[PDB]
C-alpha cells in the first residue's frame, strides 16, 4: 500500500490514495 498521510499504517476513516 502507499499511505497518503505517510505513517505506513491504515487508520479508520483516513483518506485512501
Ligand atoms: La495512515
Amino acid at each position: 500500500f502507499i499511505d497518503t498521510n505517510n505513517d505506513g499504517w491504515i487508520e479508520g476513516d483516513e483518506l485512501l490514495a
Side-chain angles (χ1 to χ4, degrees):
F1 120 98
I2 172 66
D3 186 54
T4 334
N5 62 356
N6 309 102
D7 53 53
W9 202 269
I10 268 295
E11 314 83 76
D13 295 342
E14 99 175 281
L15 210 180
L16 308 172

